[PDB]
Design a protein around this ligand. Structure first.
Ligand SMILES: CCN(CC)CCOc1ccc2c(c1)C=C1c3c(ccc(OC)c3O2)C(=O)N1C
Length: 123
């Protein structure tokens, strides 16, 4: 396994915003409770899952556990930076797999709910 993505970085500037707080309290914590969230709550463990090709294909891994820790630590400058981590997570799943696969159906469902909730953010 590669090291998981950083959740803190002392030479990157931090910021808290109403939108970033909404992404943690409302968006992330609601997606977390969805029945399809469990593949996406932690970095992919390629050793445990026997996916030795996973990190041969995926060069920018992302997961909701990493995102959650970045929000809690105020790692992000703005909401868009965080939204991009969500998009990387969903697109990784479509890249590493095939249309119709069970994991893809799960990601497809979560992406729809994710888009519903970021449709309107706080001001
Ligand atoms: C929630 C805490 N633990 C302990 C049970 C759950 C383990 O998380 C897991 C378990 C199984 C998982 C994954 C994540 C996430 C996957 C995945 C993918 C592809 C194939 C695959 O399997 C063929 C697969 O399998 C994929 O693209 N992702 C993102």
């Amino acid at each position: 396994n590669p090291p998981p993505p950083e959740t803190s970085n002392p030479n990157k500037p931090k910021r808290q915003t109403n939108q970033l707080q909404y992404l943690l309290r409302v968006v992330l914590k609601t997606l977390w409770k969805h029945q399809f969230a469990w593949p996406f709550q932690q970095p992919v463990d390629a050793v445990k899952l026997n996916l030795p090709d996973y990190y041969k294909i995926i060069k920018t891994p992302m997961d909701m556990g990493t995102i959650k820790k970045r929000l809690e630590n105020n790692y992000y400058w703005n909401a868009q930076e965080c939204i991009q981590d969500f998009n990387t997570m969903f697109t990784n799943c479509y890249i590493y797999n095939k249309p119709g696969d069970d994991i893809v159906l799960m990601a497809e469902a979560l992406e729809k709910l994710f888009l519903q909730k970021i449709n309107e953010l706080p001001t």
